[PDB]
Design an enzyme around this catalytic site. Sequence first.
Site, PDB file in Angstrom:
ATOM      1  N   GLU F  51       0.823  -1.205   0.000  1.00  0.00           N
ATOM      2  CA  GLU F  51       0.000   0.000   0.000  1.00  0.00           C
ATOM      3  C   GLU F  51       0.860   1.259   0.000  1.00  0.00           C
ATOM      4  OE1 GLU F  51      -0.669   2.254   2.745  1.00  0.00           O
ATOM      5  OE2 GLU F  51      -2.183   3.345   1.596  1.00  0.00           O
ATOM      6  N   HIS F  52       2.046   1.190   0.602  1.00  0.00           N
ATOM      7  CA  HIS F  52       2.989   2.301   0.486  1.00  0.00           C
ATOM      8  C   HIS F  52       3.624   2.357  -0.899  1.00  0.00           C
ATOM      9  CE1 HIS F  52       2.326   2.378   4.721  1.00  0.00           C
ATOM     10  NE2 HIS F  52       3.139   3.403   4.883  1.00  0.00           N
ATOM     11  N   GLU F 128       7.157   5.300  11.190  1.00  0.00           N
ATOM     12  CA  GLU F 128       5.790   5.598  11.569  1.00  0.00           C
ATOM     13  C   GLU F 128       5.400   4.667  12.703  1.00  0.00           C
ATOM     14  OE1 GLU F 128       3.131   5.143   8.283  1.00  0.00           O
ATOM     15  OE2 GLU F 128       3.889   3.159   7.733  1.00  0.00           O
TER      16      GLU F 128
END
Lengths: 413, 417, 48, 97, 98, 400, 24
Positions: F51-52, F128
Amino acid sequence: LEFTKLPNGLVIASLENYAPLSRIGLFVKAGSRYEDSNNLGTSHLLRLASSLTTKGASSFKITRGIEAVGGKLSVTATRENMAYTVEGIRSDIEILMEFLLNVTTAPEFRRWEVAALRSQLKIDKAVAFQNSQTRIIENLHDVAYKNALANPLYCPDYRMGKITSEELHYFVQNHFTSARMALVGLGVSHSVLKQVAEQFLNMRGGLGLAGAKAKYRGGEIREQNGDNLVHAAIVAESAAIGNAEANAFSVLQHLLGAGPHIKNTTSLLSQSVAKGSHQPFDVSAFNASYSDSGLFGIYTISQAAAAGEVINAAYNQVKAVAQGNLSSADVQAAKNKLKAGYLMSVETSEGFLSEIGSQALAAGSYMPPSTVLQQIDSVADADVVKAAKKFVSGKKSMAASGNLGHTPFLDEL
Amino acid sequence: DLEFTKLPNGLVIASLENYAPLSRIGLFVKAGSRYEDSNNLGTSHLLRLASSLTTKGASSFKITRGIEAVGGKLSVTATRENMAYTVEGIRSDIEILMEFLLNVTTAPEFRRWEVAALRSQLKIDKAVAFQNSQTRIIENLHDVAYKNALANPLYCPDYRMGKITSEELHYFVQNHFTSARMALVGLGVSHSVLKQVAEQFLNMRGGLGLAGAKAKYRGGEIREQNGDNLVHAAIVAESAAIGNAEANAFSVLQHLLGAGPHIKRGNNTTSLLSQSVAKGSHQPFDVSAFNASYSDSGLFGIYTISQAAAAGEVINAAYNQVKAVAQGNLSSADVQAAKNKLKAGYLMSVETSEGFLSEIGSQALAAGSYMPPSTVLQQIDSVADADVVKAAKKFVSGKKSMAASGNLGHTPFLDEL
Amino acid sequence: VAARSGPFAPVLSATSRGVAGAVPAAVLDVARPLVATVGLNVPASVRF
Amino acid sequence: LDGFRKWYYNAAGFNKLGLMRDDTLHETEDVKEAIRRLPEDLYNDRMFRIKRALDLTMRHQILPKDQWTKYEEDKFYLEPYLKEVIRERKEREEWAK
Amino acid sequence: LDGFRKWYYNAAGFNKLGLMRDDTLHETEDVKEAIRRLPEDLYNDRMFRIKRALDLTMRHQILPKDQWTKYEEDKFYLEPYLKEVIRERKEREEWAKK
Amino acid sequence: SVPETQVSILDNGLRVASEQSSHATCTVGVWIDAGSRYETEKNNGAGYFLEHLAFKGTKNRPGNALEKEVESIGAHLNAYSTREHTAYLIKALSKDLPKVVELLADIVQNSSLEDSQIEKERDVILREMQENDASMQNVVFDYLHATAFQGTPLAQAVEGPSENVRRLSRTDLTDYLNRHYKAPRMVLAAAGGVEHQQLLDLAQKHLSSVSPCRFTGSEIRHRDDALPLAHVAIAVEGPGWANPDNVTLQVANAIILCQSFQTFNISYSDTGLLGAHFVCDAMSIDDMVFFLQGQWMRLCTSATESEVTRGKNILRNALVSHLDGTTPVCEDIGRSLLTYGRRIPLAEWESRIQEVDAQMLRDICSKYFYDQCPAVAGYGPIEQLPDYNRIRSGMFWLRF
Amino acid sequence: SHTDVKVPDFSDYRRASKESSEAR
């Protein structure tokens, strides 16, 4: 009176008036101007850290030993200078110098002690900002300068809980060096000052960390807080320590009005306000000069409503002095007021010790009260006018607080 | 379709019946925080939080339990110019929803024990709002940018908590909640009913209303050293007021410079600003263009979030990019892409029901007229390349106002910027 | 200091007496014109 | 009826302690809510009157006859608010019913 | 001698519960003060060590011998902090005596 | 009245669903039945890291030129991943409908994972996560899932453990991509100003190439006394997506002391978590819990018609709002085709809401709340948070 | 983040599925 300077850079100034109570102070160029944005408020905790346990002695001992002989240990701090002063009977000043020189030279800065001291830091800041003059002068310095003299004397709210032992140790190791220190003693022999100046004050002998040059910024910071009276300070850049223009600015504040001699409507400012406004007011001239830069301006307290034109009236009076509208008798009275204020400032023992101290750190030399008198006399009328035009033209910095609905701005002022 | 009727009282009635299952009725007043002065600061915040108080017609208990009984929603949105009280619910319950909303707008009581209970909620709401750095830096930016009107904060100051009285709220309502400053806008309702409720209610005050002062620009900079990990800095200047032609231009200028990453975690590989920062700084950053235009004055500038250390040159890089746009260094394809981004943002803003009701509402209070989405599209198209450049030079020259917060040891000043 | 600050000298002369009205005993749930928005059930929201 | 109410007001005897009728109400939940909604000056006068009556009852004295309270001299200050407290109270009750 | 000391260390058995000697010291004001002076890391670690011991005791079980703290492994972390507290107390006491 | 959700199926199995409306901007998305539940603990962060990587360039559109295209029409590009579904959605104008679909086609197939990018996105993801711990409620809900679905892939978090994040390679990703991106497990959903026939033709033109759990009922606890506030989540086992009494349970949530109190009904394929999360000061925690448990038992024992009517009205308002706006609608189309296999219209939702009365609400609440073993996840100053016997005893009443 | 660590298995303690819960 001596002010022999030790090779380490330490200045030993001594006097033996044989006074019953003798006073010994130590002066360091370690004010709040030597911090940066990473260690703000460190000098406040260092000032309040006077009681912390040092390698020399336990806090208990240090305290109980100063209170056992009834002596006094105090810390006074400006934006440039710190001064640790002890005073007591001549028969106990040996252990008083032991305690004071241990506090100056060899602190420990234990982490539980500073963790206990941070609440006292908050309490001291609240007590200091209980009056409006302190907050408006701190705001005025913050809006007037960029880096050095804009640093507050009191610790910011976010920095409480964040000041560590390592920051205090770094500040002491970088600014408490022998070339920035003068040891001044009234009522003591010069010799002993020297012996204590070798057992202590000689080990840390670098020139330390040099501070940045202060830069003027101008601007205005206001604070609407609903007080009954509006406080407003409007200053500009002025002369520094070590110039005759500083003497001209001191003569200019004593011409405009500085401090109420009588429990001073005569003040040009006070007269110019009082001829138009019947409300209660307090208008004076503010001057704060440090070794690289100075601030000179006007300070007003007034009812919020009249706050505008009163400020304008005060400003207009300075413009009259900038236009040469002054008399020689007024300048002579200003010189007499300034020299009487200097002599009454040095007539007390702790003021005398502070003066000698300041002179030491500033110029390494002692200037006899007499010498000063003739230098203040050197200032002449035109000189005063000159300083005025400097204020009248230089970009201003304005700190205001209160109900500021009728307080003017700098572009309107 | 859209049908607008400005009642003689000054109130405007706008309605659209689209047979939506949930219908939304809002009422828009020109009573933002710009209409206070130094004596009644924070009154609009307590008025915004005082929407569920006792009214002449329904108590606080009756209002709260009656709106929650049908599952409807009552909300208050406030800008510096405008307040909007919005209710929404099923079509079969919007009669009593209009009863509740029009009672809240027209006939409050403002009992002193209720506002004394509400002041603690005022403090809590201000703390929750200032939990993020953007809100504090925009409030500081407005306070340093303006002198009197738009410098008033959206949130109540700390000293004014405990000092706001019932008489100040009553005076503010009686001086700014008049019919000539109000528009009642309803999606999913018949226009007729809006009018009947517009005679039973809103008849309380029909005057023009206490006129506010003209906002005056001041320039300046207010900084806040608070030891945050990131430095936030907004540098703005005076621009066109809202409802201005240059405003659209300035809108095209922010969409050329960058107005929010379209892609998730958008690298803004297109945003001039983002490109000009990213070609020199490898640290994490977020640079965008800020534009806030009100009916007499506007603020346009740059907004930067960055690591404290790089905070300087990043700001400088962003500033330099705007100077390039002030020198004519732009391409027509970039301006066309900016226009497409702006018009897509407008259409997606009006595609939702509450955004559509707000837009109609704003247009009503602002110009008394409804501008079809289509009309706007051709006006945005009217903005042309030179126009964009022009707005830029306005920012590049006009005195700036700077709000900074964080570890500001390497954050530059305006005379250095 | 007093020579220049005069009456302002105290305000420019922070001092502690070393050894030893008064202060009256002086965190919540966690680019465009901000828009405050709240509601009966609507949680407070900064629209920016 | 008016004269007989004045005679009963004299026979009740709280006017001899300087009290008002609304000072003599038993503080239930509704009465305490009505007292909390009072303005500061009325609340302070009520607390001083209650304290003076308690002191007079401690010394088993009464006020001089010129300092007594009067039947017509009854502001009934707290009465109105209680009305509200009761009204609100009932409304809430009904809703639950 | 120390061999027996290690034997005695084993005898103490806090190793069986992984308890540093300092952990074992019965709490006393002086100890508490020293504990207060302890840095967070030590404090937090001390806490878990203590908690672990109680749990083991609750189940009447001991750590794996290998997990057991060795005579050599045991550290007198709080010892110094305590020394300071004691000395200070002694000083104040003497001051009082005189 | 409501725009119909006309849908179609290609040979690939990619159901192309659309719901036209007047709005001139549309939300076109791709929904994939692939989450952390389909990962096998050796590729626990593959969906998140893909997804990144999915917006960093494809084979046909190398690098940032791709996102330059989605800047050029002014469209917005978003993606998200849950434990069961992955979504890649674009908000755009109506007239830009073809190219957007083509863009989405690249994002699902022909995607390019650059090794250079892999290291950069690893540092992004790692960092993150290293700061994600900051968000407490996310920590508490992850702790609740762990403790709840222990031993089930559902329990594993989406982001995965830092370990896997560091230890991941193109080929692994390629696998997850080539394994869990099958055409029969994909929905192309469109909402707003779109025509269904044009969208079906665009899906035929591009995108035509695309090739069980247990509820532990145990509790976990993370004590850290330096935090100012405590977050506590208590849940029981949910019914799943296809079980209709979910609707009734939603009404129960609409019926329901801590600074923040939120009720949740998280649903996965025949399982879920139904419960409450509250964030509170330490010295209040136990009282909150007691309060909360009492309300649940009241809904099991003493539900009246007025609160049921209020909950039904709240649920009707909640859904309509949910099906307003292109983004939510499309999102609803993608989830409805992935979970139910069809788009449930709002009239059927209204019928299932109006058939709910007080008797069946307290019956279903007694079925799912009464005398059940909960999963408890606490983070913060949680010493006064009661242990499992007190919570388990609060899960029933001695008076019924 | 906390995600790194995983829940230890209590299966050893764990005994023998709502079907069973009722019995259990």
